[PDB]
Amino acid sequence: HHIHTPSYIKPPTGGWNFTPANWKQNTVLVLVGFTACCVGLYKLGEAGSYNPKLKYKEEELSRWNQSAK
Amino acid sequence: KAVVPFSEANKKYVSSLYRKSLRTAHDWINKTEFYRVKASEIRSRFDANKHINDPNELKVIFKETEALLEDYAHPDPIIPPCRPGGSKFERNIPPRVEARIPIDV
Amino acid sequence: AGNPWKRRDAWRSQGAFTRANRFRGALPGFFWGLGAFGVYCVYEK
Amino acid sequence: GPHLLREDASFQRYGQLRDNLATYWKFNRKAARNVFIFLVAVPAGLGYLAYNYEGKTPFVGKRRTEPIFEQDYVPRK
Amino acid sequence: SSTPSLTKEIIYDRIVEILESYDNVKQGSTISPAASFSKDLGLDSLDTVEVLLELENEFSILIPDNEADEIKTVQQAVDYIAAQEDSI
Amino acid sequence: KSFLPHFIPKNYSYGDYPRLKPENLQKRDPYLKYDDQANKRNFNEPLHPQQDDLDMWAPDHFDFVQDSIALKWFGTFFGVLAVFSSVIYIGGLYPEKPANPRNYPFSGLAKDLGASSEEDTLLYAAKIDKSI
Amino acid sequence: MLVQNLIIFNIIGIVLLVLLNNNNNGILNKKSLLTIKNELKLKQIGLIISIINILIIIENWIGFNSNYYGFQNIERFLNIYWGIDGISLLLVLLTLILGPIAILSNWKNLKGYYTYYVISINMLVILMALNFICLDLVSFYILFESTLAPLFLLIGIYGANNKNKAAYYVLIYTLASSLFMLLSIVIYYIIINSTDYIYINNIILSINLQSLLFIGIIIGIAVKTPLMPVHTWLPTVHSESPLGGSILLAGVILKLAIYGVIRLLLPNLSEISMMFTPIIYIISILTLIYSSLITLKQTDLKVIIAYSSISHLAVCMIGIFANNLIGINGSLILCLAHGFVSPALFILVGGILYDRYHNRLINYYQGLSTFMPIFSIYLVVFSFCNTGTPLSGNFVGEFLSITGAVIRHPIIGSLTAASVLLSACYQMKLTNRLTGSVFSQYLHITNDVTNREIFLLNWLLIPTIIIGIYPSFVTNILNLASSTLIYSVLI
Amino acid sequence: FKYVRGAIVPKPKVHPGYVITSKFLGGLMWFWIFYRAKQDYPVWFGLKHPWEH
Amino acid sequence: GDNYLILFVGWEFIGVASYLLISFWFTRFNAVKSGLSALLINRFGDALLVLGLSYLVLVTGSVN
Amino acid sequence: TDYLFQNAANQALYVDNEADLKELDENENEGWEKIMYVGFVPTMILIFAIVLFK
Amino acid sequence: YNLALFHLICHSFFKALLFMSAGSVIHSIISEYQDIRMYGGFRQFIPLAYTCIFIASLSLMAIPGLTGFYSKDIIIESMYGEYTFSGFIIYWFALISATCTSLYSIRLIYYTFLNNPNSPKYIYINLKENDIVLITPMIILTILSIFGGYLLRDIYLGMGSPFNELFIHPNNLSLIETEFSLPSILKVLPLITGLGGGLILLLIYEFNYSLFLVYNNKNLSKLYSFFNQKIMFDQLLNNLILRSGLNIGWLLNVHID
Ligand SMILES: CCCCCCCCCCCC(=O)OC[C@H](COP(=O)(O)OCC[N+](C)(C)C)OC(=O)CCCCCCCCCCC
Ligand SMILES: CCCCCCCCCCCC(=O)OC[C@H](COP(=O)(O)OCC[N+](C)(C)C)OC(=O)CCCCCCCCCCC
Ligand SMILES: CCCCCCCCCCCC(=O)OC[C@H](COP(=O)(O)OCC[N+](C)(C)C)OC(=O)CCCCCCCCCCC
Ligand SMILES: CCCCCCCCCCCC(=O)OC[C@H](COP(=O)(O)OCC[N+](C)(C)C)OC(=O)CCCCCCCCCCC
Secondary structure, eight states, X not given: OOOOOTTTOOXXXXXXXXXXXXXXXXXXXXXXXXXXXXXXXXHHHXXXXXXXXXXXXXXXXXXXXHHHO | OOOOTTSHHHHXXXXXXXXXXXXXXXXXXXXXXXXXXXHHHHHHHHHTTSSOOOHHHHHHHHHHHHHHHHHSOOXXXXXXXXXXXXXXTTSSOOOOOOOOOOOOO | OOOTTTTTSGGGGSGGGSHHHHHXXXXXXXXXXXXXXXXXHHHXX | OOOOBXXXXXXXXXXXXXXXXGGGOOOOHHHHHHHHIIXXXXXXXXXXXXXXXXXXXXXXXXXXXXXXXXXXXXXXX | OOOOOOOXXXXXXXXXXXXXXXXXXXXXXXXXXXXXXXXXXXXOHHHHHHHHHHHHHHTTOOOOHHHHTTOOBHHHHHHHHHSOTTOO | OOOOOTTOOSOOOOTXXXXXXXXXXXXXXXXXXXXXXXXXXXXXXXXXXXXXXSSTTSOOOOOSSOHHHHHHHHHHHHHHHHHHHHHHHHHTOSOOOSSOOOOXXXXXXXXXXXXXXXXXXXXXXXXXXXXX | OOHHHHHHHHHHHHXXXXXXXXXXXXXXXXXXXXXXXXXXXXXXXXXXXXXXXXXXXXXXXXXXXXTOOSOEEEEEETTEEEEEOHHHHHHHHHHHHHHHHHHHHTSSOOSSOHXXXXXXXXXXXXXXXXXTSXXXXXXXXXXXXXXXXXXXXXXXXXXOTTHHHXXXXXXXXXXXXXXXXXXXXXXXXXXXXXXXXXXXXXXXOOHHHHHHHHHHHHHHHHHHTTOTTXXXXXXXXXXXXXXXXXXXXXXXXHHHHHHHHHHHTTTTSHHHHHHHHHHXXXXXXXXXXXXXXXXXXXXXXXXXXXXXXXXXXXXXXXXXXXXXHHHHHHHHHHHHHHHHHHHHHHIIIIIIIHHHHOOOBGGGOOOTTTTOHHHHHHHHHHHXXXXXXXXXXXXXXXXXXXXXXXXXXXXXXXXXXHHHHHHHHHHXXXXXXXXXXXXXTTBOOOOOOOHHHHHHHHHHHHHHHHHHHOTHHHHHHHHHXXXXXXXXXXO | OOOOTTOOOOOOOOOXXXXXXXXXXXXXXXXXXXXXXXXXXXXXXXXXXXXXX | OOSHXXXXXXXXXXXXXXXHHHTSSTTSXXXXXXXXXXXXXXXXXXXXXXXXXXXXXXXXXXXX | OTTTTOOHHHHHHHHHHHHHHXXXXXXXXXXXXXXXXXXXXXXXXXHHHHHHOO | OHHHHHHHHXXXXXXXXXXXXXXXXHHHSTTOOOOGXXXXXXXXXXXXXXXXXXXXXXXXTTOTTSHHHHHHHHHHHHHHHHOSHHHHHHHHHHHHHHHHHHHHHHHHHIIIIISOOOSOHHHHTTOOOOOHHHHHHHHHHHHHHHHHHHXXXXXXXXXXXXXXXXXXXXXXXXXXXXXXXXXXXXXXXXXXXXXXXXXXXXXXXXHOGGGGOTTSSHHHHHHHHHHHTTTTHHHHIIIIIIHHHHHHHHHIIIIIO
């Protein structure tokens, strides 16, 4: 088709329609790694998230306002 | 340079004006049937002055023609996408083919 | 010559490019929508 | 090593001219006008503004003490 | 799918249709690749320009004035259209 | 037709530097062949002292109409909208409010809008519903 | 346990390199083995010396107390008292870090005399580092101007075509101005009999004398940051000095002026610093605005980077002269961030492009991403860091400096926000040109960024991102030290 | 592929999926337009209020 | 983001990513200059956005 | 010990070979890798550790 | 703020559909032309792309029953319902904007799908619809461009709906005077100018195209050129603002530095 000089030009993103011969093997290695990070993010997100509208009762807010007066 | 009627140089110069006349007409008129009327009208305005012998008279018409083209010029002319000024011009130009020259950096 | 391109521009207004064929379907599924709405009215009586 | 850059004489003369514009500078009336604007007129404008509002802008926690909206509506009729 | 490439066989089948549909072409004037414009087809200065404008419109290109003046036969037009990556 | 951009000097004397007519390389014919096709420049062609204002990397120059004519139209367009707006205002043709603007109870919701007492009632309340 | 170990080890290091290389100089016509591979074994020893210097300050860093007010690690050496506080500690670390980076930049791009270059670089790093830990004006001035002698010879020997002009500029601009600072120092030693930091901070001089002292000190500082209109020496020096000289000059030397404001102006001339603050802002704002516009018309690749440093340090001067903690901390953060990004831009320009094509004109370069993708990645990333894009330490420094300026002066300090637009105008126009369009017709295809140049760019990028995302590593050390510089009486 | 000189373009015969999908998408819109008109044409033009029934 | 500074982080990288997307075909001159035009005009707004956040800290001492 | 204890006769033989052998000829084994990855990179890790776990 | 948010959500759906379908037309034509003057008669050759454009255009034109109608028509009404001088003026600007919104949608559709063919015959014999992968997002957006606004109207435009994130001062709540006090004519005026104005434009194009040969009239040529060059703002921005800003650096470089 054309000449892309791929012998030395090897960018991280491929360089003119690049697909390695062992692309199937690496794709599985990436999908498992990608799946292992979404689950880790989910566990971190659930354990770290909180509801900012429920951390204090309205009775507690009344005492804060009265003391601040 | 003086104008030489019925010469080879004049034919290219006149044909250059004729292309600009019809290409301008194509920009303004977006329908083929309406474009043919204007295209034939321009030629009827071109053949009428074909039998002119005096270079001095011919200079005025060339001056006149180059002013109508500038006056009627479309602000958004039609350009082929891969031609200069087109949408796909200089898109994904293939890299220059040349062997690398190593250097001991 | 008057329109020296008559025989070249003929296809631009014939067959698929006639005035009838160009607009025959300018409203996609207008009558299909009428039928479903007409059927819906009977189903709601 | 291999002289990977194809040196251009016009580029070199253009580059040399830009790096040595000071050689041909003349303190004429055009130059004096530009010098006055950038080094005297503009600094004076900032100089006046800087000291005009120096210590006159207590914006830390500035409070509103004037109602924003109108109480009663007066019709145009 | 995209255009099924563009070989000189399909290029010639489209330029010939332009000449056939041009009434200003001289009577007879057999259309062959070796045929010229001024002599074989009977085209003056302005008529040839109109043919070239249809030629560039047909393949959706723009022909510069310098290159247009070097196209005087039918085979030259076929070769000129072939030597262009943007001929569709 | 084409014209040079602003702030391009007519003359210069930089010693023995060659003096050439200032040319905007953006306006050159693109169907010609150049050594540097992208910049429309041939090798060893001399450069204007301000060539950076007259090349492809410079801001694109618009030469369809003159700047004075282009600014005359620009002012005319907004001038029409200015007169149209002022006439309706001075003439007072815009419609009147059909009803009294919305009112609210509890001294115009003063307490709910950050007011503390009767001193600051008018500082925070909305339009007060005088009809209870 | 700091200055004594740092000076003695480096002096021994200097002697060690001199003994080895100069042993066979006696018209021996010898070949020797130390000189094999462009004096590799002599460059390696000097590189090891720079690394050890970093470990020396780290040992003292372990014992540093961030909750202690006043100077720590107080030491008497050469009849001079040396001490470290929060501000001094971070600036010393930056200076020593750039040691190995500067040496590694000129590893195999010098025509010869590597041993002389290595000794000069290490000498400059130590002298500048010692200038942050001296506890009196006289010792400050001695180290402030001692760096001129190694730097003058370094530029004149290893410089570019105009090295002679650059050597005269740096020697004369930085000495004629520093002499005016010496006059103020001499006045202190005459009327107070001491130039100690702590001693002079508690003394209030007459408002007229403080004006005279401030002007003398600020002339030496303003030339060194630099500020307009005494900045014209810096573009010439950067465009001609070697890459390692540019790294030290852009990464350390220009930061001595900001540190000089901290030591010589704020705590001892506090009353007159408040009065001079509007004048300093006007000069620095014009320095920021003018330099950005001047950069738009430059054609030399390395000169463009030189002018970019002027605009950023104008923000540092604006932030450090704000009388609030936000502006002071932001100025110090921006100095550290500039200490990494600015050398990287010189490395990309004067160390990667120049070492291959040897031409610094901008017209020869365009579309470099076609055959140099790794170069373009770092060029784009460092371009955004230089423009104050978030996630970089420059943004944290610039935002806090701008915020502190607005707090100090809401009206004219708001003009500092123009750095967000102006910096992107000249920096991206250069980066957009170097990466856009087709590959240059004046360049031959050659090697991309090598492993050595990758190492330099990565380890200058890493500190910038860490400071940008979590600047609390820097703020915690600075908070107690920086709070002492504020002068206000709220009643 | 061969090009036929002087042949007018007839009605295109697209794949049946495209034609059926296009009509159904239009049929969904037109039916929904009429369905809302049957139930909201008074309120749309202000001729009646939503609660009035 | 729960504060204006986190908003500003997305605000800037929106222009960064758009600059890399408009000039994706960097071999085309028009795309290269168009991407620069989008970036510099958006940076003009960013300069004012920084000034607004600084005034927010001046008046309220927070961006939350 | 070859850089300091070798005599003149042995040293000169190595250098003459090295210039000729190098002449008979990418960007690797420059002599900095071991120094930086053993001295500099662990030093930066220690700085990272200090700002983290002090 | 509730009106702006709801129109923002709805606009994200049918405007993305327009760009996707516009890019589908460019890929369908072999020459990859982007000028509508070179299009014509695509309606039969690419009907699936035409329907996506047609449905998106009607949603954009606030045709009643569609998502745009429930999101855009209320905002235009809110200008008159404000009952102030500025709101009344903006109402006319919005009303003309609504009229133009239908005008350029009909003009774009006619040139691309209904006009007489302008591209070469070789283009039409190779004009085909794209693959399913390109089509799939467009169909999903097409359905969301019909029913999305109706389902989400009560969330954002319902009276009394809790949206405390968007604060509306009590003195600034005009959702009542906009909904009730409006004359019945204003409720349909954008519709009449849209559909009725669009039909007039369509009739002129098909049968009396000689009117739009604006290169004859001098005033029409200037008026066409002025708006085709985008109010000359690009020329003013570059030739005056950007050039002068660069010259200031040149003056600073030459006379100062
Ligand atoms: C929050 C921020 C997260 C950023 C992380 C995103 C992934 C990074 C991917 C890098 C690889 C890449 O794309 O850059 C390299 C690719 C390679 O070209 P190619 O497409 O492989 O084709 C190759 C064909 N050439 C050789 C003709 C190009 O392009 C380039 O040389 C573009 C030059 C500029 C790169 C800008 C990088 C992104 C800057 C980010 C600023 C913060
Ligand atoms: C499922 C997991 C999801 C997450 C995946 C994470 C992947 C991490 C990356 C691994 C690959 C790698 O580090 O690539 C390194 C790359 C690739 O080039 P190179 O290695 O130098 O090769 C070329 C050299 N040669 C030829 C000698 C072998 O270098 C670079 O130029 C990277 C430059 C930095 C770009 C990003 C900057 C971002 C700044 C802002 C940050 C917020
Ligand atoms: C911290 C306190 C330090 C003070 C003492 C430093 C050493 C002094 C020089 C003595 C040894 C010598 O002259 O030796 C020369 C050395 C070694 O270079 P080389 O390439 O092997 O020499 C060339 C021989 N060839 C070609 C055969 C290999 O180079 C130097 O000159 C480096 C040190 C001086 C740098 C700064 C000079 C100006 C100093 C001004 C002070 C204000
Ligand atoms: C208060 C802040 C002070 C800041 C510094 C003051 C200006 C410094 C100028 C650098 C000079 C230089 O570098 O000396 C070198 C230059 C060489 O000139 P060149 O570059 O080769 O071009 C000129 C040569 N031609 C024409 C052949 C191309 O010789 C000079 O000029 C000699 C005179 C310098 C005297 C400086 C004394 C300063 C006194 C103190 C301030 C009143």
